[PDB]
Amino acid sequence: AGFCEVCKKLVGYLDRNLEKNSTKQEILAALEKGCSFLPDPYQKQCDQFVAEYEPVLIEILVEVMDPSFVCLKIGACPS
Amino acid sequence: AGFCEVCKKLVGYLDRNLEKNSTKQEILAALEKGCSFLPDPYQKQCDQFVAEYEPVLIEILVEVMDPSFVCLKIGACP
């Protein structure tokens, strides 16, 4: 019904696997591979989420990588 | 454009599994099981698609069940 759960799973994977002082380019690269590392049921939903939110994801992730807060701030959560 | 391919895959499943004059109750039942029959990568996206579009899907599938046209008319495609 919404992108809230997939957003939190994806930002979780990034937070665990990226360092905090990653460049925008490094965040971009990771974001466009990260969906593949979520459980398979999430793949195409995650690809869609990333396509729709990619600009705002890049801009927030440089500052903060907390899954709950990032997803809240960008408007993916609640829903 | 986001839901276009999942819509066609799901309505594809319904087309294959429902007769032309299925009741709204029978279409609802199929629609709410259909996502589980699509390939694993499409599952969570299909659920979100069904949740978002379920009223209009019921509305149209009584009339027409062609995947491409149904998905176009409801606005999932292109």
Side-chain angles (χ1 to χ4, degrees):
Chain A
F3 287 126
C4 179
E5 293 308 308
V6 81
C7 177
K8 282 188 300 194
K9 287 196 178 289
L10 181 67
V11 180
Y13 178 77
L14 257 54
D15 189 32
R16 293 190 300 272
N17 292 275
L18 288 171
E19 305 106 18
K20 293 79 201 173
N21 202 144
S22 286
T23 62
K24 296 188 180 170
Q25 287 288 6
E26 294 169 342
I27 296 168
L28 187 158
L31 197 59
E32 304 195 344
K33 289 160 181 190
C35 291
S36 291
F37 299 89
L38 269 55
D40 205 17
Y42 287 91
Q43 181 75 244
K44 298 296 186 190
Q45 176 188 43
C46 185
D47 295 333
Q48 189 186 177
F49 167 69
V50 173
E52 294 187 14
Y53 283 81
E54 214 174 347
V56 296
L57 278 169
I58 298 310
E59 216 53 50
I60 189 159
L61 287 161
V62 296
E63 281 171 305
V64 57
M65 288 186 192
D66 178 71
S68 280
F69 175 81
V70 162
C71 297
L72 182 68
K73 177 106 168 209
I74 67 177
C77 294
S79 192
Chain B
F3 287 127
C4 181
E5 194 46 66
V6 75
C7 179
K8 290 188 289 201
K9 276 173 177 286
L10 176 73
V11 181
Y13 180 79
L14 302 162
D15 198 34
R16 271 178 261 121
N17 282 253
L18 293 163
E19 290 280 34
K20 198 87 177 194
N21 218 213
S22 267
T23 57
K24 293 185 170 186
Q25 170 167 33
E26 290 165 320
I27 299 176
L28 186 144
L31 207 48
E32 302 202 327
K33 281 199 209 165
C35 293
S36 75
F37 287 100
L38 263 58
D40 279 36
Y42 284 88
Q43 169 174 116
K44 293 299 175 165
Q45 181 184 45
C46 183
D47 292 342
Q48 184 188 4
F49 166 67
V50 169
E52 193 162 316
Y53 286 79
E54 220 184 335
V56 75
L57 278 169
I58 302 299
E59 202 181 4
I60 193 178
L61 290 156
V62 300
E63 301 172 329
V64 59
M65 293 176 66
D66 170 77
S68 278
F69 175 79
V70 163
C71 296
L72 174 77
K73 208 220 195 306
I74 65 166
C77 297

